[PDB]
Homo-oligomer: A and B are copies of this chain.
Amino acid sequence: AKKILVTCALPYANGSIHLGHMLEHIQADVWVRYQRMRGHEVNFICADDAHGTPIMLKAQQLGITPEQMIGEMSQEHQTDFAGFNISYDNYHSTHSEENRQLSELIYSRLKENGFIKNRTISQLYDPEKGMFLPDRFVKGTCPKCKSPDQYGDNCEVCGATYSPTELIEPKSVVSGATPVMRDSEHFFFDLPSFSEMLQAWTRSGALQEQVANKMQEWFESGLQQWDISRDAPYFGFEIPNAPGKYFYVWLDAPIGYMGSFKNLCDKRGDSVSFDEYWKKDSTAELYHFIGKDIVYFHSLFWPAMLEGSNFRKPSNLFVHGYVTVNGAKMSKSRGTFIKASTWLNHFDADSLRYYYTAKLSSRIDDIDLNLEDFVQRVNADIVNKVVNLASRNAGFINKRFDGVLASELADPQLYKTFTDAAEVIGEAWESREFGKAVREIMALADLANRYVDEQAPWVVAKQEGRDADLQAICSMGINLFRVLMTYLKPVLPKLTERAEAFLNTELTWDGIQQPLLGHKVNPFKALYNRIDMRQVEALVEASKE
């Protein structure tokens, strides 16, 4: 029924995808896949965030154009996300003509509407390289404890914090020259002019309660004008009419969501859907899945930019917490800082997808990848509860009954119990209460396994003229599997494909109301194998390096 546009945050082009990213893209993909199952028109959009000083400097160090470097990271990123079956409809780039034209448009509209201010500021500058320095590119000795080689606004030996202008004997991280303070004109977005609009939006009840609470802290501290320009030398979009000035990365980044959607419409030759989704009167829904470190940009600057440039604002923001491994922030030294590519050398995508999904909820809370629990959970739930219903029953059907399932359900009441749960489960996928959905699905799997145990096919199989009873029991367990794999289809796309090939049918949400009767099933290899702690040790060792 509805038209929905969903995004994940745009990953920086200067680093590889890691499990932190993966939590977000998996969360979003499960939700998107469920929405497609319910018949909605869904557009899942992402892109690399490819601008900024860090990127410019990285390319220079490497001796290649920033364009070449971002082109390489974009392919690396898309290869990893494809390996996790993240079902984007379009994956584009913030460094694109669509994003350029939209950034220029929104800025001009903001400026014509009075929201752009000019003010001179003073910042540390490298006279040798000939560039202003962001804080992280200034180093020197801490003014408090006199420890040398400290970077930016804080000291990693005494913990003091200070403006980098307080550093003793400051040095440019780029060239080693001594930086000096230099004036520069900057352009500022007048966020404060949207305060009332944003406060109303905050109290709507749409946003998560935790996000709303955070926003009240930000209004209390006081909204400020936002510096949205950077001087040359920069890798980004040049500001119209302002030679040597560029849009700050964060101004163009969220416009990249629009740019990626415009690109998809344009490649499809679709001249109507861009305005249908982004004009102020849209009836389409717009959702952004993001992490808690970037909520300020998506909940205050972004909606204000859209309002101020006559576009619709987000229908909701869906925020998730950080990932932890073994309970702690990811650690390079313990080998728990794991890239997405490295993960796929050791385990399949489905396992991590399942694990994260079993833990996620509609709140913001850190999600822990406990590696010991990961093995125990995947083996218990996937191999032993869900896939077991197929693996314990298929052999008999294929060997004794020519792959044909019985003509009637052995236990129609039990089947109805399973199809009756569809409403609560789909409501849980829809409300992002993933943990709740998995708990309902696994309680059904426990009932189906109890059913099989109470019928004892391993006993019926060796007894007298009980061929009919065997076929009935085994068909019954295979239909329960059909239903469970339907509920899990958003979570486990490749196991789902294997189950559809076995069952000789695509799984649709409504399809569970018609059990498979007098139906041929195919033989199969092994639908899902067990994993073990040896594999996890290998993963951790590979990541240590």
Partner-B contacts on A (CB < 8 A): 200-201, 203-206, 269-272, 280-283, 312-313, 315, 401-402, 404, 407-409, 412-413, 513-514, 518-520
Contact of A404 among B201, B270, B281 (CB under 8 A): B281
Q: Say yes or no: B413 contacts A283, CB within 8 Å.
A: no
A200 adjacent to B408 (CB under 8 Å): yes
Most chain B beta-carbon contacts within 10 A, residue among A312, A413, A520: A413
Contact B269 A413 (CB under 8 A): yes
Q: Which of B204, B401, B408, B518 contacts A412 (CB 8 A)?
A: B204
Q: Please name the residue on chain B nearest to A286 by beta carbon.
A: B518
Report the separation of the CA atoms of residues A282 and B402 in the bound assembly, to the nearest whole angstrom.
Answer: 11
Going nearest first, the 3 A-B pairs with the smallest beta carbon separation are A283-B520, A281-B404, A283-B518
**Residues in B neighbouring A200, C-beta threshold 8 A:** 408, 412
A518→B203 contact, CB < 8 A: no
Q: A201-B408, A269-B412, A281-B402 are in contact. List 19 more A-B contacts (CB 8 A).
A: A200-B408, A203-B412, A204-B408, A204-B409, A205-B513, A206-B514, A269-B413, A270-B413, A272-B413, A281-B401, A281-B407, A282-B518, A283-B404, A283-B518, A283-B519, A283-B520, A312-B407, A312-B518, A313-B407
Q: Which of chain B's residues have a CB closer than 8 A to the CB of A205?
A: 513-514
- Set of chain B residues within 8 Å of A280, measured between Cβ atoms: 407
Q: How far is the CA of A474 from the CA of B283 in the complex (A)?
A: 17
Q: How many angstroms between the C-alpha atoms of A518 and B281 in the bound complex?
A: 6
Contacts A/B (CB < 8 Å), 30 sampled: A200-B408, A200-B412, A201-B408, A203-B412, A204-B408, A204-B409, A204-B412, A205-B513, A205-B514, A206-B514, A269-B412, A269-B413, A270-B413, A271-B413, A272-B413, A280-B407, A281-B401, A281-B402, A281-B404, A281-B407, A281-B518, A282-B518, A283-B404, A283-B518, A283-B519, A283-B520, A312-B407, A312-B518, A313-B407, A315-B518
Chain B contacts for A401, CB-based, 8 A: 281
CB distance from A478 to the nearest CB of B (A): 15
A269 to B413, CA, bound (A): 7
Which chain B residues lie closer than 8 Å to A402 at the CB level?
281
Work out how many copies of this chain go into the complex. Answer: 2
A520 cross-chain contacts in B, Cβ below 8 A: 283
The docked-state distance in angstroms from the alpha carbon of A519 to that of B513 is: 31
With a cutoff of 8 Å between Cβ atoms, the chain B residues found around residue A408 in the complex are 200-201, 204
Q: Which residues of B contact A201 (CB under 8 A)?
A: 408
CA distance A409 to B201 in the complex (A): 10
Shortest distance between the CB of A278 and any CB in chain B (Å): 12
Q: Provide the residues of chain B in CB contact with A519, threshold 8 Å.
A: 283
Minimum CB–CB distance for A2 against chain B, Å: 10
CA–CA, A519 and B280, complex, Å: 12
Report the minimal beta-carbon distance from A3 to chain B, rounded to whole angstroms.
Answer: 11
Q: Which residue of B lies closest to A402 (CB)?
A: B281
- For A204, the chain B residues whose CB sits under 8 A away are 408-409, 412
Q: Which residues of B contact A413 (CB under 8 A)?
A: 269-272
Min C-beta distance of A519 to chain B, whole Å:
6
In chain B, what residue has the closest Cβ to A204? B412
A404 to B520, CA, bound (A): 48
When chains A and B are docked, how far (Å) is the Cα of A477 from the Cα of B376? 55
Q: Which residue of B lies closest to A313 (CB)?
A: B407
Contacting residues, chain B, for A409 (C-beta < 8 A): 204
Interface centre among A272, A281, A408 (most CB of B within 10 A): A281
Task: Report A335 CB to chain B, min CB distance, Å.
Answer: 45
- Give the residues in chain B near A283, CB-CB below 8 Å: 404, 518-520
Q: Who on chain B is nearest to A419 by CB?
A: B205
Bound form: Cα–Cα A200–B416 in Å: 13
For the complex formed, measure the closest distance between the CB of A323 and the CB atoms of chain B, giving whole angstroms. 30
- In the assembled complex, the Cα of A312 lies from the Cα of B406 at a distance in Å of 11
Q: A283 to B407, alpha carbons, bound, how many Å? A: 9
List of B residues within 8 angstroms of A513 by Cβ? 205
**A399, chain B: closest CB distance, angstroms:** 15
C-alpha gap A344/B409 in the complex (Å): 45
Chain B contacts of A282 at CB under 8 A? 518
Shortest CB-to-CB span from A173 to chain B, Å, is 46
